[PDB]
């Protein structure tokens, strides 16, 4: 034979590769991956101050690693490369609440993402951004939301609302109508495999990291409980 | 604008063609000829099969 | 004048093995069932198979009361104790794993590794061996017949085995599953009727503790009663038989409450029989 | 092979009525979700309405709710859109779009002059 | 606006010419052939070591080695005969969609959402595998790049365009334009003189690498095309689309020959490959199953079950002795 050296070298190389792969697996499993979505001019690039598949980001809260991605160098069509994110911890959706013209487009995109086959088991963190601008528009009172959403004329603020102190009833009503517009689609189906976590954000906010942390913790806990059939 | 598309269609149309009967006959002849040299179609002895 | 004891334990052993091997088979076949979460389930199934295959015949021998040497039949008693404690410690390990998963959801993956799970299982088995084999060293009651109660000190049983391998694990399981229920109901109250679903979760969590307690309490209660009340009448023989079979029924009930509860396990079980029975 | 040709459209006075048709061929009509989209001058594509495979579920944008109706016929492979009380802001080219895949409920078909399962479009003008 | 009438007239003329050329049907002409039988392929090897879904794989010309890519950002070179990890290359970007193996066995390539087909040298003098050349210039995601020789690599991107590169200078040499949707796959001819592509517009095109202009276009599908393969004799090809159907097209006849579909299948096809003799067609579906089709009779010869998640890639060796299938469950299986 005199050819046992080949097998010895191959086995040694495989052993070294596996030794490295073990650490690789540890690191890969210790980290959570998030997908960042949203239309242009929405604060998507500045939701998280970052002071800690094209655009990457890394941040830590309570020594828990996170990884966020932004596919911002593709064409408008997204029905193919979206499938490559079917195993992310959560999807972060950023929507400009003060753009009544693009609100319908944002809603349609959200509905498509929610109802997609390969994304049927992903929870969405919904960041409703530009609240100061929405409040300014509502207070100015030159453009009526009922022009684009006729049902707004018969909508009343929810009893469970928690208006921030000093916020006008008009602005609170408009804000919660916008939130309920997404929540209706979110609850319209899903079978309990995923949920939405609406939030009210501002351009000068800095708490977004903690909010994402809490939402991810809740998502994972619910996943485990459903696995054990508790929920 | 659409002139490129029109020229492409014209060039594509200006091409020879063969009968579908002849095409299928050629495909069948190739398949029949290369029949005994296809391990997946006709199995092979375990002696000559490296199990991979 | 005849013993139905033997036939009942033959049935129990057959049921345990044929039904615990199924869990291992399902884990082997399915690829998405191979996880550190199922490591502990497979360890518990292996312990149940071991007890059902060894302790039950050993219990039969210890009951027959055949003639043998003192310092003998202690091996059988201690092999029964070890194989029984292995399952209890595996259950406690499963409970601890579930508690960790539900209390630190974010760091669970980084905390529970395959090597750490293997170490945990090894520690469980080593502790089971140490506790079970203790009487052979310096606490045996041979200062004959294989009969158990004459070989194994009942004082040792009551003082050590119960209070350190049934009570403490039982209380830990109670606390763990109470915290799990609290977390589940808090998460359900977040608009995840509430009363129906909350009650369903409560019932599901309490089929575990209830079945464990039913299987394992009566025998130790009898042991404690005998130890602390020697003057009063000793328990009937048939009661001891019933308590023993109840204790051994844990090995057969475990797969239905730990493996059959998972949807993936349920799906894989159907495929196995539907394919290999036909 | 896949083709969508839209009929109807033209000139009309404010508050009038109109009907559009979109005859399709090259695919199994009954297995797909159909939509109507429009592009007003100087603006991007905007989704108007859609209908399900069986015609059970229907959706309209807020701007046109109560005035437009979308109808579907599977025995003839025709898609309709009845436009009523149409306002001057409805001037645009109305395309007839099919969703990319069958037996699903989700679509990404407002791409900038890129979607391949969208028709040529028919002009609709409302004015004096 | 007048050009639309001319385009419609040309399309009608082409359709009429094809209808005239349609003398008979392949199903009719192959009616009297004895059926292939029943294929009972069984798994021979299982390759473990990937952490995430496997997106692509490719066989070496030696019929023993192969490469694969996964979402964790690793390329692994396998030795199928004796399961062993020859190499494990960590990629800069973890979103990789394709892999390639050079015919000479000296280089491998991969790319993805980074819009680059990177090239790695497997025969470095130092002994450590490192990236050699990075190709930039594509706008959309990179869905396929396949080696032509040690210096030329063909590429397809999601921006509706293919390209021919010069690895030495890293400069595009030819650009193939005309597709309306994202190009999803391509297949080289054995004579390495042409290649076909399939895009997200239910159409496929025949290209001439030396010239750089489309020669023919084929349209018989209803939805996007995900896979494409070339017949062994280089006179036909097969495709798989989202309409749960595969079709066979002939270059010389310029039409689809036969359609492989079953009413029980409503899932898209993710991969297609041909056996060495060209008689069996192997297709992967989203239902975690791969079917084997009698390419001459459109009869299901057999099935390849035993994958948990969606099956994503397929391959048959140059010597045609085995079939490799990867899937989203992160396992590769070799079938006799
Ligand atoms: N007092 C006892 N009499 C008989 N068997 C016993 C007794 N205590 C324990 N065992 C056996 O040992 C196991 C655990 O100690 C029990 O499940 C039973 O099989």
Author numbering:
A (entry chain D): 10 to 61, 206 to 384
B (entry chain C): 11 to 62
C (entry chain A): 5 to 147, 164 to 212, 223 to 308
D (entry chain E): 1 to 128
E (entry chain B): 5 to 340
What do the paper's sentences say?
Here, using the adenosine-A2A receptor (A2AR) as a model system and applying 19F quantitative NMR (19F-qNMR), we visualize the conformational landscape of this GPCR in response to ligand actions and transducers such as G proteins. We identified two transient active-like intermediates (S3 and S4) that are positioned between the inactive (defined as S1 and S2) and the fully activated states (S5)15. We also determine the structures of A2AR at S4 in complex with mini-Gαsβγ, revealing how the G protein engages with the intermediate S4.
In addition to this predominant S4 structure, two dynamic snapshots, referred to as S4d1 and S4d2, were identified. Visual comparison between these snapshots suggests that S4d1 and S4d2 represent dynamic variations of the predominant S4 conformation, which we simply refer to as S4 conformation, with minimal changes in the receptor and its engagement with G protein, but noticeable swinging motions of the G protein. Structural changes in S4d1 and S4d2 reached up to 2 Å, primarily near the TM6 region. While the Cα5 helix of mini-Gαs which engages the receptor, remained stable, the αN helix and the outermost portion of the G protein exhibited more pronounced shifts. As highlighted in Fig. 4g, the S4-mini-Gαsβγ adopts a less compact conformation than the S5-mini-Gαsβγ. The Cα5 helix is rotated outward and retracted from the G protein-binding pocket, accompanied by the disengagement of the αN helix of the Gαs protein from the H8 helix of the receptor. This retraction measures ~2 Å, and the rotation is at a 2° spinal clockwise angle from the S5-mini-Gαsβγ. This transition is halted due to the loss of a key intermolecular interaction between the residue R291 from the R291A mutant and E328 from the G proteinGs, a salt bridge essential for lifting the Ras-like domain of Gαs to disengage the AHD.
